[PDB]
Amino acid sequence: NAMAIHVGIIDQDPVRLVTPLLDHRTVSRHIIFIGDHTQTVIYQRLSDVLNKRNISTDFFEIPAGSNTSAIKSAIRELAETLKARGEEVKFNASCGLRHRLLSAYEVFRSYHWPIFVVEPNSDCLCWLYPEGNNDTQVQDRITIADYLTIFGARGEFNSPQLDQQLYQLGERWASNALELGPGLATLNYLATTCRKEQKLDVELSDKQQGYRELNLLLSDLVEAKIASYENGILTFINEEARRFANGEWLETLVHSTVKQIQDDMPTIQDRSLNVQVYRQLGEREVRNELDVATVVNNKLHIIECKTKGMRDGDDTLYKLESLRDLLGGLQARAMLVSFRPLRHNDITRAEDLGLALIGPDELKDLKTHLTQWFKAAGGN
Ligand SMILES: [Mg+2]
């Protein structure tokens, strides 16, 4: 209980030093992170997440050079103080540069303290010493919010009859996506006119009033009781209905589908819609939005939804991959869900970058393709 502690080596992706302490089966409620002076900030972030849970933390600084007899010396001093107290040390060897990792391993192994690693792909906690201990699957407890904090960012986060109408409307549009293509573009332009004018009504031109697919859409809005359409005037009942017709329908559907899959897939441990993400650089800031964000098997999964086509020096896929890396580190995964067809360029490019895709053809199987993507996270 009180004497049980973890020791871990900070690196640039230290999530696997936190997830063992969040697992309800772990006795230890204290960890000492070993790092160099420039990793104080990573320490502070790690501590924000763990301290929230009343898990306590300390930072023990090794010298920053590559001299390993000096590292082993610093760590043996630490070990000897821990040994003198009767601390029941467990060494989490999941993280850290290999020179520091193996120096700490030598020291801790000589004290006969248990040593384990979370294999990042399987998420299994594996006992390196003593091999007799039983490996377990790390529980899935960390949130998106915690994930962002760890990686130096901060997120800002967010009926029943309305929700179901918005859900079923999305299903219809997703499953007839190619049929509805052009019409949803015109609806997007109409919703955008309302947005720019700050109103919920818009008069259609006579040409717009004769468009076949648009009219299919207008009458869906009407049946769903989220707009009225009378004498060429389209009125949304509210801003959320206007945003929905503007194109937020697809991310709403994806969020709603993830929530359905999660009822039977406990590895999906967190989910959110339109997370605002902030990162400070001195006085400056970079702001991003995550259309649907999840954590699954302790790995951050981001889904970008597009309802318009990709340009043409397009940045969508380079940017998505870049967010993935920077917000969830090496195990993070990302998907683009696209209402419009994807050019082969962008397909080949998504493959090159390791980004998953769901296009219009597969939108009628959204729930299955999403399940498959989430199963591939492991953890079951
Ligand atoms: Mg290394």
PDB file of N, CA and C in Angstrom, residues 268-359:
ATOM      1  N   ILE A 268     -13.196   1.212 -26.073  1.00  0.00           N
ATOM      2  CA  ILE A 268     -13.377   2.622 -26.430  1.00  0.00           C
ATOM      3  C   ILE A 268     -13.718   3.284 -25.122  1.00  0.00           C
ATOM      4  N   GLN A 269     -12.777   3.999 -24.557  1.00  0.00           N
ATOM      5  CA  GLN A 269     -12.856   4.326 -23.165  1.00  0.00           C
ATOM      6  C   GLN A 269     -13.259   5.804 -23.026  1.00  0.00           C
ATOM      7  N   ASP A 270     -13.214   6.557 -24.126  1.00  0.00           N
ATOM      8  CA  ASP A 270     -13.573   7.979 -24.138  1.00  0.00           C
ATOM      9  C   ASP A 270     -13.939   8.474 -25.564  1.00  0.00           C
ATOM     10  N   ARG A 271     -14.802   9.473 -25.685  1.00  0.00           N
ATOM     11  CA  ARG A 271     -15.178   9.977 -27.010  1.00  0.00           C
ATOM     12  C   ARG A 271     -15.683  11.359 -26.856  1.00  0.00           C
ATOM     13  N   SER A 272     -15.511  12.166 -27.907  1.00  0.00           N
ATOM     14  CA  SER A 272     -15.941  13.546 -27.860  1.00  0.00           C
ATOM     15  C   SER A 272     -16.215  14.084 -29.245  1.00  0.00           C
ATOM     16  N   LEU A 273     -17.020  15.142 -29.322  1.00  0.00           N
ATOM     17  CA  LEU A 273     -17.429  15.804 -30.548  1.00  0.00           C
ATOM     18  C   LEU A 273     -16.847  17.196 -30.588  1.00  0.00           C
ATOM     19  N   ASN A 274     -16.118  17.502 -31.644  1.00  0.00           N
ATOM     20  CA  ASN A 274     -15.597  18.844 -31.893  1.00  0.00           C
ATOM     21  C   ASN A 274     -14.755  19.413 -30.749  1.00  0.00           C
ATOM     22  N   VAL A 275     -13.745  18.654 -30.335  1.00  0.00           N
ATOM     23  CA  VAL A 275     -12.849  19.095 -29.299  1.00  0.00           C
ATOM     24  C   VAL A 275     -12.042  20.289 -29.828  1.00  0.00           C
ATOM     25  N   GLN A 276     -12.081  21.418 -29.115  1.00  0.00           N
ATOM     26  CA  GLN A 276     -11.148  22.533 -29.379  1.00  0.00           C
ATOM     27  C   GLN A 276      -9.802  22.297 -28.668  1.00  0.00           C
ATOM     28  N   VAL A 277      -8.681  22.405 -29.390  1.00  0.00           N
ATOM     29  CA  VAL A 277      -7.360  22.042 -28.866  1.00  0.00           C
ATOM     30  C   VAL A 277      -6.467  23.272 -29.005  1.00  0.00           C
ATOM     31  N   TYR A 278      -5.845  23.655 -27.896  1.00  0.00           N
ATOM     32  CA  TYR A 278      -4.966  24.802 -27.807  1.00  0.00           C
ATOM     33  C   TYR A 278      -3.536  24.379 -27.417  1.00  0.00           C
ATOM     34  N   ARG A 279      -2.524  24.980 -28.070  1.00  0.00           N
ATOM     35  CA  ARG A 279      -1.123  24.817 -27.671  1.00  0.00           C
ATOM     36  C   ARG A 279      -0.452  26.185 -27.614  1.00  0.00           C
ATOM     37  N   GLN A 280       0.150  26.527 -26.482  1.00  0.00           N
ATOM     38  CA  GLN A 280       0.841  27.796 -26.338  1.00  0.00           C
ATOM     39  C   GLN A 280       2.277  27.666 -26.813  1.00  0.00           C
ATOM     40  N   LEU A 281       2.739  28.650 -27.593  1.00  0.00           N
ATOM     41  CA  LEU A 281       4.183  28.821 -27.890  1.00  0.00           C
ATOM     42  C   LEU A 281       4.609  30.260 -27.562  1.00  0.00           C
ATOM     43  N   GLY A 282       5.188  30.468 -26.382  1.00  0.00           N
ATOM     44  CA  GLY A 282       5.386  31.842 -25.904  1.00  0.00           C
ATOM     45  C   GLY A 282       4.039  32.559 -25.874  1.00  0.00           C
ATOM     46  N   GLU A 283       3.981  33.769 -26.401  1.00  0.00           N
ATOM     47  CA  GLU A 283       2.718  34.516 -26.453  1.00  0.00           C
ATOM     48  C   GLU A 283       1.797  34.023 -27.555  1.00  0.00           C
ATOM     49  N   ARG A 284       2.281  33.062 -28.328  1.00  0.00           N
ATOM     50  CA  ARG A 284       1.540  32.710 -29.523  1.00  0.00           C
ATOM     51  C   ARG A 284       0.749  31.431 -29.312  1.00  0.00           C
ATOM     52  N   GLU A 285      -0.135  31.147 -30.240  1.00  0.00           N
ATOM     53  CA  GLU A 285      -0.996  30.009 -30.074  1.00  0.00           C
ATOM     54  C   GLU A 285      -1.290  29.305 -31.385  1.00  0.00           C
ATOM     55  N   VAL A 286      -1.310  27.969 -31.344  1.00  0.00           N
ATOM     56  CA  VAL A 286      -1.980  27.204 -32.412  1.00  0.00           C
ATOM     57  C   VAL A 286      -3.239  26.441 -31.967  1.00  0.00           C
ATOM     58  N   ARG A 287      -4.353  26.721 -32.652  1.00  0.00           N
ATOM     59  CA  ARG A 287      -5.700  26.171 -32.349  1.00  0.00           C
ATOM     60  C   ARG A 287      -6.040  25.116 -33.412  1.00  0.00           C
ATOM     61  N   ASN A 288      -6.569  23.977 -32.973  1.00  0.00           N
ATOM     62  CA  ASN A 288      -6.998  22.934 -33.866  1.00  0.00           C
ATOM     63  C   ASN A 288      -8.366  22.469 -33.401  1.00  0.00           C
ATOM     64  N   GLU A 289      -9.107  21.751 -34.249  1.00  0.00           N
ATOM     65  CA  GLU A 289     -10.383  21.140 -33.823  1.00  0.00           C
ATOM     66  C   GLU A 289     -10.396  19.665 -34.158  1.00  0.00           C
ATOM     67  N   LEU A 290     -10.753  18.808 -33.208  1.00  0.00           N
ATOM     68  CA  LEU A 290     -10.873  17.374 -33.495  1.00  0.00           C
ATOM     69  C   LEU A 290     -12.356  17.033 -33.691  1.00  0.00           C
ATOM     70  N   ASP A 291     -12.736  16.688 -34.924  1.00  0.00           N
ATOM     71  CA  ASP A 291     -14.143  16.468 -35.236  1.00  0.00           C
ATOM     72  C   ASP A 291     -14.752  15.398 -34.309  1.00  0.00           C
ATOM     73  N   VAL A 292     -14.168  14.200 -34.306  1.00  0.00           N
ATOM     74  CA  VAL A 292     -14.511  13.178 -33.317  1.00  0.00           C
ATOM     75  C   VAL A 292     -13.193  12.655 -32.812  1.00  0.00           C
ATOM     76  N   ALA A 293     -13.026  12.714 -31.507  1.00  0.00           N
ATOM     77  CA  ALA A 293     -11.837  12.186 -30.854  1.00  0.00           C
ATOM     78  C   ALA A 293     -12.261  11.037 -29.948  1.00  0.00           C
ATOM     79  N   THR A 294     -11.480   9.948 -29.955  1.00  0.00           N
ATOM     80  CA  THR A 294     -11.637   8.844 -28.991  1.00  0.00           C
ATOM     81  C   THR A 294     -10.296   8.425 -28.384  1.00  0.00           C
ATOM     82  N   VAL A 295     -10.356   7.723 -27.258  1.00  0.00           N
ATOM     83  CA  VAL A 295      -9.213   6.915 -26.828  1.00  0.00           C
ATOM     84  C   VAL A 295      -9.722   5.464 -26.856  1.00  0.00           C
ATOM     85  N   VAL A 296      -8.900   4.565 -27.409  1.00  0.00           N
ATOM     86  CA  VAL A 296      -9.239   3.173 -27.526  1.00  0.00           C
ATOM     87  C   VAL A 296      -8.001   2.374 -27.200  1.00  0.00           C
ATOM     88  N   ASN A 297      -8.117   1.420 -26.262  1.00  0.00           N
ATOM     89  CA  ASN A 297      -6.996   0.653 -25.799  1.00  0.00           C
ATOM     90  C   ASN A 297      -5.832   1.575 -25.446  1.00  0.00           C
ATOM     91  N   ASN A 298      -6.161   2.659 -24.738  1.00  0.00           N
ATOM     92  CA  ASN A 298      -5.185   3.630 -24.286  1.00  0.00           C
ATOM     93  C   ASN A 298      -4.406   4.348 -25.414  1.00  0.00           C
ATOM     94  N   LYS A 299      -4.874   4.232 -26.680  1.00  0.00           N
ATOM     95  CA  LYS A 299      -4.313   4.958 -27.837  1.00  0.00           C
ATOM     96  C   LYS A 299      -5.305   6.052 -28.357  1.00  0.00           C
ATOM     97  N   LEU A 300      -4.805   7.277 -28.565  1.00  0.00           N
ATOM     98  CA  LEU A 300      -5.669   8.396 -29.073  1.00  0.00           C
ATOM     99  C   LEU A 300      -6.044   8.108 -30.507  1.00  0.00           C
ATOM    100  N   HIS A 301      -7.348   8.125 -30.798  1.00  0.00           N
ATOM    101  CA  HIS A 301      -7.872   7.948 -32.170  1.00  0.00           C
ATOM    102  C   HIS A 301      -8.630   9.213 -32.570  1.00  0.00           C
ATOM    103  N   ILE A 302      -8.151   9.859 -33.629  1.00  0.00           N
ATOM    104  CA  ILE A 302      -8.797  11.064 -34.167  1.00  0.00           C
ATOM    105  C   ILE A 302      -9.464  10.826 -35.530  1.00  0.00           C
ATOM    106  N   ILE A 303     -10.671  11.345 -35.654  1.00  0.00           N
ATOM    107  CA  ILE A 303     -11.397  11.224 -36.903  1.00  0.00           C
ATOM    108  C   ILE A 303     -11.713  12.634 -37.407  1.00  0.00           C
ATOM    109  N   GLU A 304     -11.223  12.932 -38.614  1.00  0.00           N
ATOM    110  CA  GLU A 304     -11.599  14.146 -39.305  1.00  0.00           C
ATOM    111  C   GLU A 304     -12.744  13.765 -40.232  1.00  0.00           C
ATOM    112  N   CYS A 305     -13.829  14.534 -40.175  1.00  0.00           N
ATOM    113  CA  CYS A 305     -14.931  14.436 -41.157  1.00  0.00           C
ATOM    114  C   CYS A 305     -14.873  15.574 -42.206  1.00  0.00           C
ATOM    115  N   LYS A 306     -14.849  15.211 -43.483  1.00  0.00           N
ATOM    116  CA  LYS A 306     -15.046  16.163 -44.568  1.00  0.00           C
ATOM    117  C   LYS A 306     -16.360  15.880 -45.313  1.00  0.00           C
ATOM    118  N   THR A 307     -17.116  16.957 -45.538  1.00  0.00           N
ATOM    119  CA  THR A 307     -18.285  16.943 -46.433  1.00  0.00           C
ATOM    120  C   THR A 307     -18.008  17.607 -47.819  1.00  0.00           C
ATOM    121  N   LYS A 308     -16.877  18.298 -47.978  1.00  0.00           N
ATOM    122  CA  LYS A 308     -16.473  18.851 -49.273  1.00  0.00           C
ATOM    123  C   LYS A 308     -15.267  18.093 -49.822  1.00  0.00           C
ATOM    124  N   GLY A 309     -14.957  18.311 -51.097  1.00  0.00           N
ATOM    125  CA  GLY A 309     -13.857  17.607 -51.756  1.00  0.00           C
ATOM    126  C   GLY A 309     -12.476  18.172 -51.471  1.00  0.00           C
ATOM    127  N   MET A 310     -11.455  17.340 -51.651  1.00  0.00           N
ATOM    128  CA  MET A 310     -10.060  17.794 -51.505  1.00  0.00           C
ATOM    129  C   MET A 310      -9.535  18.485 -52.751  1.00  0.00           C
ATOM    130  N   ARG A 311      -9.002  19.684 -52.546  1.00  0.00           N
ATOM    131  CA  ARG A 311      -8.271  20.413 -53.575  1.00  0.00           C
ATOM    132  C   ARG A 311      -7.061  19.615 -54.046  1.00  0.00           C
ATOM    133  N   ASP A 312      -4.008  19.401 -56.279  1.00  0.00           N
ATOM    134  CA  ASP A 312      -4.077  20.831 -55.920  1.00  0.00           C
ATOM    135  C   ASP A 312      -3.300  21.322 -54.642  1.00  0.00           C
ATOM    136  N   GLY A 313      -2.206  20.645 -54.279  1.00  0.00           N
ATOM    137  CA  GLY A 313      -1.450  20.971 -53.052  1.00  0.00           C
ATOM    138  C   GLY A 313      -2.295  20.995 -51.773  1.00  0.00           C
ATOM    139  N   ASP A 314      -3.140  19.971 -51.577  1.00  0.00           N
ATOM    140  CA  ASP A 314      -4.076  19.925 -50.435  1.00  0.00           C
ATOM    141  C   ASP A 314      -3.382  19.488 -49.129  1.00  0.00           C
ATOM    142  N   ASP A 315      -3.695  20.160 -48.027  1.00  0.00           N
ATOM    143  CA  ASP A 315      -2.975  19.954 -46.777  1.00  0.00           C
ATOM    144  C   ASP A 315      -3.684  18.993 -45.815  1.00  0.00           C
ATOM    145  N   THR A 316      -4.897  18.542 -46.173  1.00  0.00           N
ATOM    146  CA  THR A 316      -5.787  17.777 -45.253  1.00  0.00           C
ATOM    147  C   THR A 316      -5.092  16.567 -44.546  1.00  0.00           C
ATOM    148  N   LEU A 317      -4.436  15.745 -45.348  1.00  0.00           N
ATOM    149  CA  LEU A 317      -3.841  14.503 -44.936  1.00  0.00           C
ATOM    150  C   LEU A 317      -2.477  14.696 -44.225  1.00  0.00           C
ATOM    151  N   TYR A 318      -1.634  15.607 -44.719  1.00  0.00           N
ATOM    152  CA  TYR A 318      -0.386  15.986 -44.019  1.00  0.00           C
ATOM    153  C   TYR A 318      -0.654  16.599 -42.669  1.00  0.00           C
ATOM    154  N   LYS A 319      -1.670  17.464 -42.639  1.00  0.00           N
ATOM    155  CA  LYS A 319      -2.088  18.076 -41.399  1.00  0.00           C
ATOM    156  C   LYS A 319      -2.682  17.069 -40.425  1.00  0.00           C
ATOM    157  N   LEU A 320      -3.546  16.174 -40.908  1.00  0.00           N
ATOM    158  CA  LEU A 320      -4.129  15.141 -40.013  1.00  0.00           C
ATOM    159  C   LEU A 320      -3.039  14.279 -39.376  1.00  0.00           C
ATOM    160  N   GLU A 321      -2.133  13.738 -40.178  1.00  0.00           N
ATOM    161  CA  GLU A 321      -1.007  12.973 -39.676  1.00  0.00           C
ATOM    162  C   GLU A 321      -0.143  13.734 -38.645  1.00  0.00           C
ATOM    163  N   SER A 322      -0.012  15.028 -38.872  1.00  0.00           N
ATOM    164  CA  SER A 322       0.770  15.849 -38.014  1.00  0.00           C
ATOM    165  C   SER A 322       0.073  16.073 -36.650  1.00  0.00           C
ATOM    166  N   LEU A 323      -1.233  16.240 -36.656  1.00  0.00           N
ATOM    167  CA  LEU A 323      -1.973  16.326 -35.415  1.00  0.00           C
ATOM    168  C   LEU A 323      -1.879  15.017 -34.584  1.00  0.00           C
ATOM    169  N   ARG A 324      -2.069  13.910 -35.267  1.00  0.00           N
ATOM    170  CA  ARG A 324      -2.009  12.594 -34.687  1.00  0.00           C
ATOM    171  C   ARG A 324      -0.694  12.433 -33.847  1.00  0.00           C
ATOM    172  N   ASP A 325       0.445  12.581 -34.520  1.00  0.00           N
ATOM    173  CA  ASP A 325       1.770  12.546 -33.893  1.00  0.00           C
ATOM    174  C   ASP A 325       1.897  13.451 -32.684  1.00  0.00           C
ATOM    175  N   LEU A 326       1.604  14.728 -32.889  1.00  0.00           N
ATOM    176  CA  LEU A 326       1.819  15.760 -31.914  1.00  0.00           C
ATOM    177  C   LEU A 326       0.847  15.686 -30.736  1.00  0.00           C
ATOM    178  N   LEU A 327      -0.332  15.081 -30.929  1.00  0.00           N
ATOM    179  CA  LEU A 327      -1.334  15.062 -29.844  1.00  0.00           C
ATOM    180  C   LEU A 327      -1.442  13.717 -29.094  1.00  0.00           C
ATOM    181  N   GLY A 328      -0.923  12.663 -29.689  1.00  0.00           N
ATOM    182  CA  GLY A 328      -1.031  11.384 -29.027  1.00  0.00           C
ATOM    183  C   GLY A 328       0.178  10.504 -29.185  1.00  0.00           C
ATOM    184  N   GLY A 329       1.219  11.021 -29.825  1.00  0.00           N
ATOM    185  CA  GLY A 329       2.478  10.313 -29.887  1.00  0.00           C
ATOM    186  C   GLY A 329       2.424   9.115 -30.758  1.00  0.00           C
ATOM    187  N   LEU A 330       3.298   8.156 -30.486  1.00  0.00           N
ATOM    188  CA  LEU A 330       3.597   7.113 -31.451  1.00  0.00           C
ATOM    189  C   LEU A 330       2.490   6.094 -31.678  1.00  0.00           C
ATOM    190  N   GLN A 331       1.635   5.911 -30.691  1.00  0.00           N
ATOM    191  CA  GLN A 331       0.572   4.916 -30.799  1.00  0.00           C
ATOM    192  C   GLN A 331      -0.720   5.566 -31.334  1.00  0.00           C
ATOM    193  N   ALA A 332      -0.732   6.899 -31.489  1.00  0.00           N
ATOM    194  CA  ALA A 332      -1.997   7.527 -31.927  1.00  0.00           C
ATOM    195  C   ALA A 332      -2.391   7.142 -33.373  1.00  0.00           C
ATOM    196  N   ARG A 333      -3.690   7.104 -33.614  1.00  0.00           N
ATOM    197  CA  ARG A 333      -4.209   6.708 -34.937  1.00  0.00           C
ATOM    198  C   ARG A 333      -5.205   7.739 -35.447  1.00  0.00           C
ATOM    199  N   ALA A 334      -5.272   7.896 -36.758  1.00  0.00           N
ATOM    200  CA  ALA A 334      -6.204   8.857 -37.328  1.00  0.00           C
ATOM    201  C   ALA A 334      -6.887   8.359 -38.606  1.00  0.00           C
ATOM    202  N   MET A 335      -8.113   8.822 -38.759  1.00  0.00           N
ATOM    203  CA  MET A 335      -8.953   8.443 -39.865  1.00  0.00           C
ATOM    204  C   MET A 335      -9.543   9.711 -40.545  1.00  0.00           C
ATOM    205  N   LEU A 336      -9.708   9.675 -41.859  1.00  0.00           N
ATOM    206  CA  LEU A 336     -10.521  10.728 -42.522  1.00  0.00           C
ATOM    207  C   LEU A 336     -11.808  10.103 -43.030  1.00  0.00           C
ATOM    208  N   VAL A 337     -12.952  10.629 -42.577  1.00  0.00           N
ATOM    209  CA  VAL A 337     -14.238  10.203 -43.143  1.00  0.00           C
ATOM    210  C   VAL A 337     -14.668  11.277 -44.167  1.00  0.00           C
ATOM    211  N   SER A 338     -14.893  10.870 -45.414  1.00  0.00           N
ATOM    212  CA  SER A 338     -15.156  11.802 -46.495  1.00  0.00           C
ATOM    213  C   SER A 338     -16.484  11.444 -47.160  1.00  0.00           C
ATOM    214  N   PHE A 339     -17.376  12.430 -47.247  1.00  0.00           N
ATOM    215  CA  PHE A 339     -18.647  12.302 -47.902  1.00  0.00           C
ATOM    216  C   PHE A 339     -18.482  12.270 -49.421  1.00  0.00           C
ATOM    217  N   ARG A 340     -17.448  12.950 -49.930  1.00  0.00           N
ATOM    218  CA  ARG A 340     -17.197  13.004 -51.345  1.00  0.00           C
ATOM    219  C   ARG A 340     -16.111  12.024 -51.764  1.00  0.00           C
ATOM    220  N   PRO A 341     -16.134  11.577 -53.034  1.00  0.00           N
ATOM    221  CA  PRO A 341     -15.176  10.594 -53.563  1.00  0.00           C
ATOM    222  C   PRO A 341     -13.748  11.028 -53.287  1.00  0.00           C
ATOM    223  N   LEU A 342     -12.842  10.076 -53.114  1.00  0.00           N
ATOM    224  CA  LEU A 342     -11.448  10.427 -52.890  1.00  0.00           C
ATOM    225  C   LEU A 342     -10.606  10.100 -54.127  1.00  0.00           C
ATOM    226  N   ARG A 343      -9.883  11.085 -54.623  1.00  0.00           N
ATOM    227  CA  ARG A 343      -8.996  10.883 -55.761  1.00  0.00           C
ATOM    228  C   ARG A 343      -7.898   9.830 -55.401  1.00  0.00           C
ATOM    229  N   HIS A 344      -7.360   9.106 -56.384  1.00  0.00           N
ATOM    230  CA  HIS A 344      -6.378   8.059 -56.084  1.00  0.00           C
ATOM    231  C   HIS A 344      -5.080   8.527 -55.427  1.00  0.00           C
ATOM    232  N   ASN A 345      -4.652   9.725 -55.801  1.00  0.00           N
ATOM    233  CA  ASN A 345      -3.602  10.469 -55.151  1.00  0.00           C
ATOM    234  C   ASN A 345      -3.713  10.455 -53.665  1.00  0.00           C
ATOM    235  N   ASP A 346      -4.914  10.778 -53.202  1.00  0.00           N
ATOM    236  CA  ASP A 346      -5.131  10.984 -51.802  1.00  0.00           C
ATOM    237  C   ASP A 346      -5.300   9.660 -51.082  1.00  0.00           C
ATOM    238  N   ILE A 347      -5.780   8.681 -51.816  1.00  0.00           N
ATOM    239  CA  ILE A 347      -5.808   7.328 -51.315  1.00  0.00           C
ATOM    240  C   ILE A 347      -4.396   6.787 -51.079  1.00  0.00           C
ATOM    241  N   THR A 348      -3.589   6.833 -52.119  1.00  0.00           N
ATOM    242  CA  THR A 348      -2.198   6.447 -52.042  1.00  0.00           C
ATOM    243  C   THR A 348      -1.479   7.278 -50.973  1.00  0.00           C
ATOM    244  N   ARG A 349      -1.816   8.537 -50.837  1.00  0.00           N
ATOM    245  CA  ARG A 349      -1.166   9.349 -49.859  1.00  0.00           C
ATOM    246  C   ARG A 349      -1.542   8.981 -48.410  1.00  0.00           C
ATOM    247  N   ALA A 350      -2.835   8.736 -48.166  1.00  0.00           N
ATOM    248  CA  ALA A 350      -3.327   8.263 -46.882  1.00  0.00           C
ATOM    249  C   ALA A 350      -2.630   6.935 -46.490  1.00  0.00           C
ATOM    250  N   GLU A 351      -2.483   6.020 -47.439  1.00  0.00           N
ATOM    251  CA  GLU A 351      -1.764   4.786 -47.209  1.00  0.00           C
ATOM    252  C   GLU A 351      -0.276   5.005 -46.830  1.00  0.00           C
ATOM    253  N   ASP A 352       0.420   5.825 -47.614  1.00  0.00           N
ATOM    254  CA  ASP A 352       1.802   6.252 -47.347  1.00  0.00           C
ATOM    255  C   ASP A 352       1.972   6.811 -45.918  1.00  0.00           C
ATOM    256  N   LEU A 353       1.060   7.687 -45.516  1.00  0.00           N
ATOM    257  CA  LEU A 353       1.030   8.270 -44.173  1.00  0.00           C
ATOM    258  C   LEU A 353       0.415   7.376 -43.048  1.00  0.00           C
ATOM    259  N   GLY A 354      -0.162   6.219 -43.372  1.00  0.00           N
ATOM    260  CA  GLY A 354      -0.794   5.383 -42.333  1.00  0.00           C
ATOM    261  C   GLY A 354      -2.118   5.943 -41.800  1.00  0.00           C
ATOM    262  N   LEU A 355      -2.891   6.645 -42.648  1.00  0.00           N
ATOM    263  CA  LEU A 355      -4.179   7.256 -42.218  1.00  0.00           C
ATOM    264  C   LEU A 355      -5.256   6.343 -42.759  1.00  0.00           C
ATOM    265  N   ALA A 356      -6.272   6.075 -41.954  1.00  0.00           N
ATOM    266  CA  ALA A 356      -7.365   5.234 -42.438  1.00  0.00           C
ATOM    267  C   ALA A 356      -8.343   6.135 -43.224  1.00  0.00           C
ATOM    268  N   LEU A 357      -9.114   5.550 -44.130  1.00  0.00           N
ATOM    269  CA  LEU A 357     -10.117   6.324 -44.878  1.00  0.00           C
ATOM    270  C   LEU A 357     -11.485   5.638 -44.850  1.00  0.00           C
ATOM    271  N   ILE A 358     -12.530   6.443 -44.744  1.00  0.00           N
ATOM    272  CA  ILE A 358     -13.864   5.969 -45.129  1.00  0.00           C
ATOM    273  C   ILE A 358     -14.492   6.961 -46.150  1.00  0.00           C
ATOM    274  N   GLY A 359     -14.654   6.509 -47.374  1.00  0.00           N
ATOM    275  CA  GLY A 359     -15.292   7.357 -48.367  1.00  0.00           C
ATOM    276  C   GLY A 359     -16.758   7.023 -48.590  1.00  0.00           C
TER     277      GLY A 359
END
